[PDB]
Amino acid sequence: LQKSKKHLTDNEFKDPETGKTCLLKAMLNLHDGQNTTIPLLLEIARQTDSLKELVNASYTDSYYKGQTALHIAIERRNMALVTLLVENGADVQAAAHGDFFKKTKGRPGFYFGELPLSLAACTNQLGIVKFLLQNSWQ
Amino acid sequence: TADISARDSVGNTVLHALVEVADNTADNTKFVTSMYNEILMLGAKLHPTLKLEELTNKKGMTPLALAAGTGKIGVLAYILQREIQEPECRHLSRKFTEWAYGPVHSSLYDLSCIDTCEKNSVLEVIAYSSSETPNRHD
């Protein structure tokens, strides 16, 4: 890809009608606190520009809408991972109001508050919520 | 070697025999429910391509429907809530997990022969039970 322009190239490669970029999918299919691609894809994104579109890439459908990579970071317990995302220009004011994050017993979604600060709070992640408020620039 | 398919004069395999021996006590339920796992592990470890619970006896009753009919509730609780967590013994898991976000998780129980098998479904064998089947109402 570094031989190519990468701009539309990877924006077309993400899964149709779901907005699943390489970083989001890397965190759902990780294991025991690592995938070995999540640093790597961010290494690709700091040499090849447009990292800010990658970390802040959220789903497109109205059923997973707004769930950035950071929501998956908090939830899956890897407190060291979420350090890298906020460092690497990831959004923390991301609003995930799809339909899995509303109040409906059809498709029984889990409502956490539509802010990653509230996901950690509702998840028994107190060391992480403390980190969300003393984290670097953002 | 011992043939794990323990067909006898009455037709009861080892799993059948382990249903017929139960008593719905705590010491016995704690025991027999465990033993199925290792017999099932070993049946999947030493003789694959033969799931052992579909086998029947002379009267034509699976160990599932033999526990449904003979009043074995803790035995039946195991075989229905069976959740084996290890590869190459996992197809025999009866209670799967289709997802788990935070505390929420969608258990994915199988309706193999609870309803609509060619004979002796668990609901039939409980509902269409005679009168003195112990624990019938529980």
Side-chain angles (χ1 to χ4, degrees), chain B residues 1-71:
Chain B
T1 62
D3 187 73
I4 190 164
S5 296
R7 299 292 182 88
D8 61 358
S9 179
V10 65
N12 287 319
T13 61
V14 62
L15 295 176
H16 294 88
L18 288 173
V19 174
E20 183 64 26
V21 71
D23 292 330
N24 291 316
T25 62
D27 291 331
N28 196 357
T29 301
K30 186 181 264 76
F31 177 73
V32 176
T33 58
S34 297
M35 185 62 72
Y36 291 166
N37 207 162
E38 291 88 6
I39 301 297
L40 281 173
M41 290 180 186
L42 283 169
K45 182 67 181 294
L46 283 303
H47 183 73
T49 64
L50 189 158
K51 76 287 290 182
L52 186 61
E53 290 183 354
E54 66 90 19
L55 279 74
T56 61
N57 57 6
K58 184 175 87 274
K59 63 179 75 67
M61 292 178 73
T62 58
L64 179 62
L66 184 61
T70 59

Side-chain angles (χ1 to χ4, degrees), chain A residues 74 112 115-126 128-129 132:
Chain A
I74 293 169
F112 67 90
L115 186 68
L117 190 150
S118 300
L119 184 61
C122 296
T123 308
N124 193 358
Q125 297 182 5
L126 188 31
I128 293 172
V129 174
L132 273 299

Side-chain angles (χ1 to χ4, degrees), chain A residues 75 100-101 110 112 119, chain B residues 99-104:
Chain A
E75 177 185 349
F100 182 75
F101 298 108
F110 180 75
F112 67 90
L119 184 61
Chain B
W99 60 273
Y101 182 84
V104 182

Side-chain angles (χ1 to χ4, degrees), chain A residues 54-67:
Chain A
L54 183 63
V55 297
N56 294 321
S58 66
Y59 294 90
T60 57
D61 58 356
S62 297
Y63 183 70
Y64 293 108
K65 184 169 70 177
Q67 183 179 1

